[PDB]
């Protein structure tokens, strides 16, 4: 019994984390087979970041301009190319600990685990959600660029690589194909994080987790229509619950016996009259950073 912010085990990814230095600039890289993937701003300098031309900068770089270290062991760069905001460094040795992997782009609202790394050494692992405005509320210090996010399906799904911190203390990054989540750019310019909303399907999944764990005070007798629920939800800056969200809650409704619209009604109550100083699962706010899948894993 119990419920906790639970990350995937990190061991498969720890063995892929290397250090990548380009002159003065250092960050982490992902070492898969005989390629190392890292944020392409490693080839810049602080002066460049204002308006940088990455195309030329890469031309003037040569393989020797890149120092890759995996542990004490140096890796030799024998080629370099650029895919969107991600740099791909070809190396002589294939990573012996390469796991079965695949590059996925995640939808906003889905969660992943983040392995925070410094100078290619892992420091910790935590869970994160892709907010609806395509930012994540991570925990990153100077030198963590190139940390990655993943899910495990024994196949690792890499889905996030860290690039910058927005002014609100919130982070932005790319997928392993180099494309930024959201509208952000690896150049020094004014970049706003949009107005955020709450991930409805996740708050629901969380309430199911509460019921499974014996916390059911908030269950009511009423029901609602999906459309009438969305009318109340949007008023509270909640994401509109979709038919595809409804199917995904399926396992949780089956396990508890509580249908989805039953729970939507219980949530409507909480949204209107608040909690009245009570805790659902020891938390006094509503939690929206657990996907339905996440609940199924911990309550299987």
């Amino acid at each position: 019994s119990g419920f906790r912010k639970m990350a995937f085990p990190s061991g498969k990814v720890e063995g892929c984390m290397v250090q990548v230095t380009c002159g003065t600039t250092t960050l982490n890289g992902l070492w898969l087979d005989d390629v190392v993937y890292c944020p392409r701003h490693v080839i810049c300098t602080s002066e460049d970041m204002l308006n940088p031309n990455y195309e030329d900068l890469l031309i003037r770089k040569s393989n020797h301009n890149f120092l890759v270290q995996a542990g004490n062991v140096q890796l030799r760069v024998i080629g370099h190319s650029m895919q969107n905001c991600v740099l791909k460094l070809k190396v002589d040795t294939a990573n012996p600990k390469t796991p079965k992997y695949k590059f996925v782009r995640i939808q906003p609202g889905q969660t992943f685990s983040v392995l925070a790394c410094y100078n290619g050494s892992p420091s910790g692992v935590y869970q994160c959600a892709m907010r609806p405005n395509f930012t994540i509320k991570g925990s990153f210090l100077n030198g963590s660029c190139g940390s990655v996010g993943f899910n495990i399906d024994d196949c690792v799904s890499f889905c996030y690589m860290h690039h910058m911190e927005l002014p609100t203390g919130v982070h932005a990054g790319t997928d392993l194909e180099g494309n930024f989540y959201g509208p952000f750019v690896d150049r020094q310019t004014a970049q706003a994080a949009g107005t955020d909303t709450t991930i409805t399907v996740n708050v629901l999944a969380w309430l199911y987790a509460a019921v499974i764990n014996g916390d059911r005070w908030f269950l009511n007798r009423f029901t609602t229509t999906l459309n009438d629920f969305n009318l109340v939800a949007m008023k509270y800056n909640y994401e509109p619950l979709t038919q595809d969200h409804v199917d995904i809650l399926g396992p949780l409704s089956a396990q508890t016996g509580i249908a989805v619209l039953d729970m939507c009604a219980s949530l409507k109550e909480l949204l209107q009259n608040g909690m009245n100083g009570r805790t659902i699962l020891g938390s006094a706010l509503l939690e929206d950073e657990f996907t339905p899948f996440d609940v199924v894993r911990q309550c299987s």
Binding site: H41, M49, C145, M164, Q188
Partner: peptide
């Protein structure tokens, strides 16, 4: 501005 979490960080032009 934004901050890039190199190193070594690209900061705040800002100043």
């Amino acid at each position: 501005x934004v901050t890039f979490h190199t190193x070594x960080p690209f900061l705040x032009p800002x100043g």
